[PDB]
């Protein structure tokens, strides 16, 4: 019947970062013709697959790479039987058995699969707690391209980023951040989740912002005040700066959901030099009242002056982190 649970408390991130993330697998986000002798049909839609499917193993050998397909196109056509690759769909593994026609020009013979390795982008780190030295960032799922399903994390790898200039765009939309990802390739994190508020990992050392390098207590949803805010963000090089927000609307999350606040770009050097909420800001934090409340995730399709952003606690319960202040053991 005693008193006295303890406060949590996390580092605001901002910098720009580059996000690799290695899917399991290889991830199959389409399909494609190949030449037949008599009538024209492709394997992969006959055989039993389709966009967002993941082959991890092809005929009961896990694949780890795009390369992995090389040794087998050759091996396929010899043998000639069938191709009884199992692939994975949700939590669920599923097994067609298919046989690879050929392609005129090379010679050689073809899957007609499209498949992609990876998924790449460049977005804003959110925080790490220092005891754990685990982190958020991002605070929005990673999607493929062509599929806009999440990709399933085998690994990834996290990286500095630069902001090398802003270009107006005459057709089109006109404001472009153009980004400069680290060719050193230095991994200052790794990535265990790909998340529906976010990308988290465990860093290698703690980084710097130089503006906000001091931890934060976290907020719950029914903290968060209409009215001013700030966000940490990169728009110049590698620097993270401070820009004045405004907490436009927010609602009480009862259960994990995604956009808990509505947020409106009220910084005037922001409005100039990007005309508010632009690629790259995908995990930049929002910080009112000395707390880390959470990160911007949306612009308004049309309103890049406004946006939306996911509240705190959902990255943190996604992180492995307790905010009523517990702690696990070793």
């Given at each position: 019947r005693h008193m006295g649970l303890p406060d949590l408390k996390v580092i605001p991130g901002g910098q720009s970062i580059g996000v690799k993330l290695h899917s399991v697998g290889?991830?199959?986000?389409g399909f494609h013709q190949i030449n037949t002798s008599e009538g024209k049909k492709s394997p992969g839609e006959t055989a039993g697959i389709e966009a967002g499917?993941?082959?991890?193993?092809?005929n009961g050998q896990k694949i780890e790479k795009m390369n992995d397909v090389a040794p087998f196109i050759q091996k396929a056509g010899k043998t000639g039987?069938?191709?009884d690759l199992l692939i994975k769909r949700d939590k669920q593994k599923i097994k067609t058995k298919l046989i690879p026609e050929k392609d005129e020009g090379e010679g050689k013979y073809r899957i007609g699969l499209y498949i992609r390795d990876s998924a790449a982008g460049i977005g804003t780190m959110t925080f790490y707690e220092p005891k754990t030295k685990k982190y958020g960032a991002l605070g929005h799922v990673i999607s493929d391209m062509d599929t806009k399903k999440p990709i399933v994390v085998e690994n990834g790898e996290i990286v500095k980023s630069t902001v090398t200039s802003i270009e107006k765009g005459t057709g089109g939309n006109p404001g472009e951040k153009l980004a400069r990802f680290s060719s050193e390739r230095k991994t200052i994190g790794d990535i265990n989740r790909n998340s529906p508020f976010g990308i988290f990992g465990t860093l290698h050392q703690p980084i710097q912002n130089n503006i906000s390098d001091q931890a934060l207590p976290v907020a719950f949803s029914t903290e968060v005040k209409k009215g001013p805010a700030e966000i940490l963000t990169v728009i110049d090089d590698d620097k993270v700066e401070k820009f004045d927000i405004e907490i436009v609307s927010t609602t009480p999350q009862k259960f994990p959901a995604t956009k808990g606040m509505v947020l409106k770009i009220t910084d005037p050097r922001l409005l100039k030099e990007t005309g508010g909420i632009v690629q790259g800001m995908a995990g930049a934090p929002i910080i009112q009242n000395g707390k880390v409340i959470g990160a911007v995730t949306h612009v308004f399709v049309n309103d890049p002056t406004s946006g939306y952003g996911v509240h705190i606690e959902w990255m943190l319960s996604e992180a492995g982190?307790?905010?009523?202040?517990k702690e696990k053991a070793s």
């Open positions: 290889v991830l199959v986000v499917d993941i082959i991890i193993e092809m039987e069938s191709l982190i307790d905010i009523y202040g």
